[PDB]
Amino acid sequence: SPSDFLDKLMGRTSGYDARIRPNFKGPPVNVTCNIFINSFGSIAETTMDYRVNIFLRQKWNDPRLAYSEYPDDSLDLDPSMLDSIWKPDLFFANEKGANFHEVTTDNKLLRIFKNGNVLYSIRLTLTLSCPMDLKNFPMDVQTCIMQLESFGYTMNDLIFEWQDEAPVQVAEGLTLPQFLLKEEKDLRYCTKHYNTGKFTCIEVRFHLERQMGYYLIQMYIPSLLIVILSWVSFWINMDAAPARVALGITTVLTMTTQSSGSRASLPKVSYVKAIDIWMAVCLLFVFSALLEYAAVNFVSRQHKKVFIDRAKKIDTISRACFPLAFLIFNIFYWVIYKILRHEDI
Amino acid sequence: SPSDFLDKLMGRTSGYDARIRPNFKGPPVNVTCNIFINSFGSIAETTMDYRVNIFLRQKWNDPRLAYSEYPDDSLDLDPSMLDSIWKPDLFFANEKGANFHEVTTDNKLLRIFKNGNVLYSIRLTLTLSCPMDLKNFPMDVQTCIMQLESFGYTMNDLIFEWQDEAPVQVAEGLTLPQFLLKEEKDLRYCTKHYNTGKFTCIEVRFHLERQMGYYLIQMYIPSLLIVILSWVSFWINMDAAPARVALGITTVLTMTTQSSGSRASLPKVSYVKAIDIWMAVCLLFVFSALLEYAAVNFVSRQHKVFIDRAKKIDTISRACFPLAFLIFNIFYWVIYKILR
Amino acid sequence: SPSDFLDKLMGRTSGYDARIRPNFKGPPVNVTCNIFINSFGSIAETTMDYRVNIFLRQKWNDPRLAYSEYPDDSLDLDPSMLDSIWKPDLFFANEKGANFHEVTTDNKLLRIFKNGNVLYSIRLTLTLSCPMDLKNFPMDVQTCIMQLESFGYTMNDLIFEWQDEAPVQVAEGLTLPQFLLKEEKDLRYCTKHYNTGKFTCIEVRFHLERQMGYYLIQMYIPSLLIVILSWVSFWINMDAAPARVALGITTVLTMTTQSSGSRASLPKVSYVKAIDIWMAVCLLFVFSALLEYAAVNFVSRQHKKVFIDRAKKIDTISRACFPLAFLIFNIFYWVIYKILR
Amino acid sequence: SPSDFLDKLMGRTSGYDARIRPNFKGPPVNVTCNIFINSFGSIAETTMDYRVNIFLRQKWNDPRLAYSEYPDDSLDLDPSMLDSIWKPDLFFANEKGANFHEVTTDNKLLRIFKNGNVLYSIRLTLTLSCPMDLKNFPMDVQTCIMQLESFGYTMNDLIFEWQDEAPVQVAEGLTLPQFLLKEEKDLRYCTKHYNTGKFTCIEVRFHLERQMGYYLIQMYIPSLLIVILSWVSFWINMDAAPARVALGITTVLTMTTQSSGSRASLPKVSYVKAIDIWMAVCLLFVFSALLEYAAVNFVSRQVFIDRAKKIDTISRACFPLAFLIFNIFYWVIYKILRHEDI
Amino acid sequence: VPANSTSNILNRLLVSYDPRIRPNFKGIPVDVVVNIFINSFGSIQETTMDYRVNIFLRQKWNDPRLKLPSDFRGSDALTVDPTMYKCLWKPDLFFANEKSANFHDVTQENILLFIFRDGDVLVSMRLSITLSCPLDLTLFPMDTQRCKMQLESFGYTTDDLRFIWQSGDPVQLEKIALPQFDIKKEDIEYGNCTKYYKGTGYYTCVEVIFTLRRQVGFYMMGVYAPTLLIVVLSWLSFWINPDASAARVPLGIFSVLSLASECTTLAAELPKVSYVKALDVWLIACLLFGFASLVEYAVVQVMLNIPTAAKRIDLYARALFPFCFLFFNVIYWSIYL
Numbered sequence A: 001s002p003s004d005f006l007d008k009l010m011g012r013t014s015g016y017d018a019r020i021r022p023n024f025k026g027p028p029v030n031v032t033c034n035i036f037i038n039s040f041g042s043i044a045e046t047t048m049d050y051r052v053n054i055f056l057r058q059k060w061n062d063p064r065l066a067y068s069e070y071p072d073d074s075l076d077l078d079p080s081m082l083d084s085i086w087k088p089d090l091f092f093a094n095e096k097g098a099n100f101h102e103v104t105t106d107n108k109l110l111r112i113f114k115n116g117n118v119l120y121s122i123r124l125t126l127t128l129s130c131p132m133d134l135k136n137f138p139m140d141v142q143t144c145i146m147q148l149e150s151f152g153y154t155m156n157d158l159i160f161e162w163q164d165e166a167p168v169q170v171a172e173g174l175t176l177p178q179f180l181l182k183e184e185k186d187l188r189y190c191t192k193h194y195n196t197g198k199f200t201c202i203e204v205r206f207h208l209e210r211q212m213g214y215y216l217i218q219m220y221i222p223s224l225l226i227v228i229l230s231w232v233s234f235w236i237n238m239d240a241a242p243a244r245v246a247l248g249i250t251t252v253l254t255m256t257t258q259s260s261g262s263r264a265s266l267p268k269v270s271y272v273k274a275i276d277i278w279m280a281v282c283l284l285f286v287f288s289a290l291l292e293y294a295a296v297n298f299v300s301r302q303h304k305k306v307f308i309d310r311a312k313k314i315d316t317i318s319r320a321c322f323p324l325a326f327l328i329f330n331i332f333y334w335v336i337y338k339i340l341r342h343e344d345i
Numbered sequence B: 001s002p003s004d005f006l007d008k009l010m011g012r013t014s015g016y017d018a019r020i021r022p023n024f025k026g027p028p029v030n031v032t033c034n035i036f037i038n039s040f041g042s043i044a045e046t047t048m049d050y051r052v053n054i055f056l057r058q059k060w061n062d063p064r065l066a067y068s069e070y071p072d073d074s075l076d077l078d079p080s081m082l083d084s085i086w087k088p089d090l091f092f093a094n095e096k097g098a099n100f101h102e103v104t105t106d107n108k109l110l111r112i113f114k115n116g117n118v119l120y121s122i123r124l125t126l127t128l129s130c131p132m133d134l135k136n137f138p139m140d141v142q143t144c145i146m147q148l149e150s151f152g153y154t155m156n157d158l159i160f161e162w163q164d165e166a167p168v169q170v171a172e173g174l175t176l177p178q179f180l181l182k183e184e185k186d187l188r189y190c191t192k193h194y195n196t197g198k199f200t201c202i203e204v205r206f207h208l209e210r211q212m213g214y215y216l217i218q219m220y221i222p223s224l225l226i227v228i229l230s231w232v233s234f235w236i237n238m239d240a241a242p243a244r245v246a247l248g249i250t251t252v253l254t255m256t257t258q259s260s261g262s263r264a265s266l267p268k269v270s271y272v273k274a275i276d277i278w279m280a281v282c283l284l285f286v287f288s289a290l291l292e293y294a295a296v297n298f299v300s301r302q303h304k305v306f307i308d309r310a311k312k313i314d315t316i317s318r319a320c321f322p323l324a325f326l327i328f329n330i331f332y333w334v335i336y337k338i339l340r
Numbered sequence C: 001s002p003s004d005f006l007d008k009l010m011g012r013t014s015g016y017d018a019r020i021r022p023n024f025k026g027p028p029v030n031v032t033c034n035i036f037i038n039s040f041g042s043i044a045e046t047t048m049d050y051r052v053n054i055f056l057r058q059k060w061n062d063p064r065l066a067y068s069e070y071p072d073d074s075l076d077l078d079p080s081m082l083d084s085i086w087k088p089d090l091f092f093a094n095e096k097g098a099n100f101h102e103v104t105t106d107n108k109l110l111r112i113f114k115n116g117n118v119l120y121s122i123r124l125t126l127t128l129s130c131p132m133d134l135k136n137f138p139m140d141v142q143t144c145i146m147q148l149e150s151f152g153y154t155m156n157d158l159i160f161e162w163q164d165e166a167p168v169q170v171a172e173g174l175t176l177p178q179f180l181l182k183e184e185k186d187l188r189y190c191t192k193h194y195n196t197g198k199f200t201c202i203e204v205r206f207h208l209e210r211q212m213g214y215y216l217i218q219m220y221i222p223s224l225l226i227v228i229l230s231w232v233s234f235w236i237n238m239d240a241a242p243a244r245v246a247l248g249i250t251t252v253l254t255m256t257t258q259s260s261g262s263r264a265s266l267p268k269v270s271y272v273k274a275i276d277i278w279m280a281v282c283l284l285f286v287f288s289a290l291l292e293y294a295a296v297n298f299v300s301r302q303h304k305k306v307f308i309d310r311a312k313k314i315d316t317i318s319r320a321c322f323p324l325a326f327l328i329f330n331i332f333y334w335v336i337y338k339i340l341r
Numbered sequence D: 001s002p003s004d005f006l007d008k009l010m011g012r013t014s015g016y017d018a019r020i021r022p023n024f025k026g027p028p029v030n031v032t033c034n035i036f037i038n039s040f041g042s043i044a045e046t047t048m049d050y051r052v053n054i055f056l057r058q059k060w061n062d063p064r065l066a067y068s069e070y071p072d073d074s075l076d077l078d079p080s081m082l083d084s085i086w087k088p089d090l091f092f093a094n095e096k097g098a099n100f101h102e103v104t105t106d107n108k109l110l111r112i113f114k115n116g117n118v119l120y121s122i123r124l125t126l127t128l129s130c131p132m133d134l135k136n137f138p139m140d141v142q143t144c145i146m147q148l149e150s151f152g153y154t155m156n157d158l159i160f161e162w163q164d165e166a167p168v169q170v171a172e173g174l175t176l177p178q179f180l181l182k183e184e185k186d187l188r189y190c191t192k193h194y195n196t197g198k199f200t201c202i203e204v205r206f207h208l209e210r211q212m213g214y215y216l217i218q219m220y221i222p223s224l225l226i227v228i229l230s231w232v233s234f235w236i237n238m239d240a241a242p243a244r245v246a247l248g249i250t251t252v253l254t255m256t257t258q259s260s261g262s263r264a265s266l267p268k269v270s271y272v273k274a275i276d277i278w279m280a281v282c283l284l285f286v287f288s289a290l291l292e293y294a295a296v297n298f299v300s301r302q303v304f305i306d307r308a309k310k311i312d313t314i315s316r317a318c319f320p321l322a323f324l325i326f327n328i329f330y331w332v333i334y335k336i337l338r339h340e341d342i
Numbered sequence E: 001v002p003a004n005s006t007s008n009i010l011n012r013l014l015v016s017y018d019p020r021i022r023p024n025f026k027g028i029p030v031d032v033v034v035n036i037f038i039n040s041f042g043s044i045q046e047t048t049m050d051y052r053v054n055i056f057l058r059q060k061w062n063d064p065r066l067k068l069p070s071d072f073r074g075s076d077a078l079t080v081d082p083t084m085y086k087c088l089w090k091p092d093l094f095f096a097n098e099k100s101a102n103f104h105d106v107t108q109e110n111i112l113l114f115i116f117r118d119g120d121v122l123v124s125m126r127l128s129i130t131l132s133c134p135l136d137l138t139l140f141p142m143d144t145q146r147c148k149m150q151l152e153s154f155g156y157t158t159d160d161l162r163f164i165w166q167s168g169d170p171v172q173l174e175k176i177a178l179p180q181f182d183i184k185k186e187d188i189e190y191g192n193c194t195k196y197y198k199g200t201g202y203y204t205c206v207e208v209i210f211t212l213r214r215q216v217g218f219y220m221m222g223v224y225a226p227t228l229l230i231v232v233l234s235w236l237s238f239w240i241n242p243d244a245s246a247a248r249v250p251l252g253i254f255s256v257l258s259l260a261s262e263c264t265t266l267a268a269e270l271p272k273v274s275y276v277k278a279l280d281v282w283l284i285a286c287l288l289f290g291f292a293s294l295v296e297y298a299v300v301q302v303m304l305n306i307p308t309a310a311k312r313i314d315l316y317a318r319a320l321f322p323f324c325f326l327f328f329n330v331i332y333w334s335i336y337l
């Protein structure tokens, strides 16, 4: 009977203790753990964290759980008595609150192989934290990590190891809300040395690249429209002074409001950002246009002959020069932040 | 045998009670505790709270747990058996909600030394509260604390001490979004005297200094640009009166909107703040420019030497305003830099 | 023997049952309770609640747990045996979610005296609910309460009385974000009469005085500056009609947006608040200034005979009357909402 | 000896299996339940639900608990012994997450009478969801319901009945944030027919009345003031075209900002609300004022001055009348005729 | 014999019954009939891509061992205690597309167990799942979402467990009303995915696909009308007397400022997606037309310094821009059908 087999294998009469690691006072027990991402998203820079729904699985071996009576080489099992068998320790380093899922049943799958290998797959919901750098907000590349390491055992007793083929699988059709998950994934070791000793560790890196289209169409187009409107005002003659000054003031108002909104919709980072410098350049251009208009007005009332001609000449020269300066600054900014110093590694 | 050894140490046959402190009716026991900061952040002044992810460890000794059979000098236990032995009481006095961590297992590690010393490391996620001082908001220094104290025992039974070497470690590369953690940490004693007697306590301070770059680039530059634009308005001639006055009122309105936004993005406090006074003075300067141009326009229509006097007054005011703004700016920056 | 004494006094072999109230079929057992406010804050009028971190303690006596063997008159226990003895039922009538604390252990202290007196201090975190009135929002006084009462016993079984000396202590240097906690506190009885019978009760009142510094510096000064801008508009010559138009309309816009923001920053109250009436009167003054300017334009344009003189006279009359009206309104309003309420 | 009494009544030696309902293989057991509202408010329109703190009490009878040993007829219990006795199943259909209260002890009270009647009062905290009808948002009258029904049994085993004299009480001094709880409360049956069988049900209907005052002072007064400001723009002379056009521009700006901000604290309802109608009509009137100002400009730029003056004065004398008649019609229709007074 | 005695002898932690071993072991995989019952809806947070439900999941599984022992006193179909149900074996149930799932316990566990001589076992719970679906906002104002729910087995593979939907109306709903969308019971088409995991084995997964179409009434009454009014203001800006030329600029600058503010507000009340949305198309077109009006005024002004040509240009613009915008509007309302 299978129930008798379960009782004899790891039950009370089996003389097996779940509080003792396999191969006690001997070689350390190896673990081949792999994960399966089921969902992603909710990357909030305000809290500097993101959510995952991994399908964490663990593998190991122990001669005590090996069997030779039942004909089948792999039998399923239930979590209720899985609580009564040994489970290697595994906690995530950079996490801020994770929990299991208990919906209509337990979400733990336990399988025992004939050779003694044990398959342990359990469904988890995590909220990992990765620092975010905003050296170039619209065109940055984020690298959020997931560190797995033991807590109750050292390198002498427990070790970890990534699976050889397909270690970190991703569910087909998964799409990030804003970013995009690149195919390449980094796997390495993160062996930490606390005050208590040496602990084994496992690290996997995710390469996330932000998509510029949304931020472009929603923020850069209004600034370009405002500066072209400023040039349109620039083309206005000196007779309609109130209209020109009103247009300049309105442009500066729009620029300030857009900059405030853009910088308020983001975490308060100490250093400067690409969007911040772009909007500062646009604001400075609007300010310079208004200042030169004021200078033109001032020089118009300086006949107390050629003063009007000089004002017209300087207005025409500035109107011919400012768009070229804006174009060269824009192309320089785009090329530098696309190739020269960012989008590297 | 491992299982037999565990049964002989703290099992039923061992005759050990976990509800009785070591050295009962004797000298108080000594506990040495050190923490390991693993993360930080979420310092929000709205709720006067911040979150940590410490790795609190406790070390103490009890003669009832001594052993000499196993050749190894330090074995390990499990949380299921950890809850079956005595654990020193310790709660954080200044906290507003903390919780354990369970991921595929409990996150509690218990180690027993051969000489009898016991190591107890437990992972916790806390939410500590510190009174934020906003006397100088963009240039303040925040001192958030962490009080550790007992609850079930007095000085006669339980005492708390720090560890002499590396009492508070910090994970390498720990970065904060707004503030920065100073390396220096202050450690003291906070022995309290409640109504029930005398309780041990332990306090550790963290020094956080706010970085002005974000607030500078967001608010200080636009206000200065607005006041320079008001000066630009002042440089306009008298003929375009509606234009200059309308642009002045528009600058007033945008200053008010910026002040309202800055206040909305900041938690409310009773007293004044540096940003508050800075924006108030900027608004006052813009309003003063508007008022002086209104006075010039009024004196221009006073019903032929009036225009000369008006031009002289306008030139004198346009010369004096930069001097007043510069002296105010230097005085404000120097006082909030060195004085406070 | 400590373990043997624990087994003999409150253990399994003690013969004492925790489900039986002390002095059964007799007079109700008196209970004296005192709290210790550890923190405060997070007072959100939007959800009508505030948070506390009380340090509730309870004292009572029972001959069943009395002992006379240990020479020491007071010993200490652990929650694992605290839950095995009888405790008085106690819940909070006005609360919207409360829980204990668990950090490396429970936060319950049990101390038993030789004569039979029992001390019981347990740390709690509550979310109390107190109705708030905003008739005079910037200078209001709020009295949030805390009702302690039993649920499972009547007056014949359980009663509650406050401690005579220092019943409610406050943590030294308590700092509230907006309000301030006055030292004087009110204590009384709140004996209720439910449908199931008569239940004991205990109340305590906290007097809170809201500070108006933030509200002042945020809203009162800008409105005053805007009305001074309108008064500036009063002195502009009639020729500069677009100038006065722009000033009036911008004052209207800033008054509207400031009023909208101020009213949105406050919870949803059906009746009228002081800030509402202040914004309404400021907007009305701005509107009246614009209307009088339009009337000046109309009377000036009516000529197309001493109409310039009449327009100048009415403009001077407005510029000399509206400041006086604003001053008298401001002083009357401040006096009324300072002393009359 | 209360312990021996409990052991004989519902103890291990009592032979009282809690899994067996009273009157097994017989007539269904009747349960009379009444509630005691302790708090209200926090009605979130976006989330379409509200919160209560009821004091649900349940009354029923079972001969298996009949006793005569004690001279007293009504004793008391604790939740520890409550867990060992049968408990009638009950849950709320229109709920989205409820929980008990655990403050220094359990919040459940048990009382057994000599005749066999058992009283079971337990403190609860519910989050009930009720659809909101926003046909006339500033004048709406909401009807939120609380349904009680069984889940573990059918009409053949468990039934329900409201208590007769004062079943639903309200704590004195209750203050709702926005609405006003009507004293008269409806009570009827809601017996459902699920796939598994026929389940008993119990429903109590509330009545809520929204107050205009807040929304009134928020929206309606600025609209009237800006309409009068538009009339002020109208009365300006013709040659001051920039002044009039600027006043029209600022009036339409503030009107559209007010319209946008009116629905900030409201769900994205499919149909049209009263406040939406008011905002749309005010915007249309300001727009028409600007349009007629433009028409006056066109006429003056093409006897022409006489025609421009006559159309200006005619429209300036007619538009306030149109606004007044629209206002009175709208107020009377939405206060009596179309959607109000049931 | 007491009813409790029959329930115990059928199964109990003391009586010789093992809930751990599946029914029909080493034999035919268990056939489980699953039907759902919607009780509420809503909380469709587009910013987080998740919708909350409250279901009445019912699953019928037949166990040879969990069968009536005859003569217990069955008569009417037996009702099993939920604690007995916890003792009773349960086939594993999980749903892949859920942000989280929470059970509902309104003063009692919401679990009903039914036992019949057929030995078939009817089990019903009450869940409060918060599922997740990928929203598609390409044609956001007139889109059609396909939020779906799929139930999967976790503990057992296809070789031991299998799920089949109820033959007669497996999905029901009591006329639930939604704030924004409008779920229609006509199209609740469902299939199964039986997805395979590379490393563990096969798993049977059944699915349910809803159909939620967003209602444009709120948008058409709140965000489209103000834009049209701003467009008509821009049109009116053309015909004003160009003699002063100091009054035409305010119309254009107010139009562009208001359109920018509306765009920012709508972006705030909207999830962020890379692809362009129809609302963004309409807003940018309105902004571009206002900008075109302002640059037309600028061209007229620069040409004024000839009057006949400027007047003809202004008249032609005022005559053609409304017609061009009408063409654009009809084309836009045609393409976004």
Ligand SMILES: *[C@@H]1O[C@H](CO)[C@@H](O)[C@H](O)[C@H]1NC(C)=O
Pocket (backbone or CB within 6 Å): A027, A028, A029, A030, A031, A161
């Ligand atoms: C475990 O696996 C490792 C490689 O991961 C191997 O070197 C070792 O021999 C294996 N066995 C033990 C007992 O460590």
Ligand SMILES: *[C@@H]1O[C@H](CO)[C@@H](O)[C@H](O)[C@H]1NC(C)=O
Pocket (backbone or CB within 6 Å): B023, B027, B028, B029, B030, B161
């Ligand atoms: C623990 O050490 C302290 C000094 O750190 C000492 O006063 C105390 O007596 C020690 N405890 C015992 C039980 O010896």
Ligand SMILES: *[C@@H]1O[C@H](CO)[C@@H](O)[C@H](O)[C@H]1NC(C)=O
Pocket (backbone or CB within 6 Å): C023, C027, C028, C029, C030, C159, C161
């Ligand atoms: C408890 O105190 C009350 C007054 O608070 C008194 O009436 C009573 O006698 C005291 N003791 C007992 C055992 O009832």
Ligand SMILES: *[C@@H]1O[C@H](CO)[C@@H](O)[C@H](O)[C@H]1NC(C)=O
Pocket (backbone or CB within 6 Å): D023, D027, D028, D029, D030, D159, D161
């Ligand atoms: C319970 O009351 C119902 C009516 O509410 C009645 O039909 C029934 O007979 C009563 N008692 C029993 C024991 O069924």
Ligand SMILES: *[C@@H]1O[C@H](CO)[C@@H](O)[C@H](O)[C@H]1NC(C)=O
Pocket (backbone or CB within 6 Å): E163, E164, E165, E191, E192, E193, E194
């Ligand atoms: C489940 O999908 C598989 C695909 O192989 C198919 O054979 C089977 O009939 C499907 N079952 C149902 C109930 O649709």
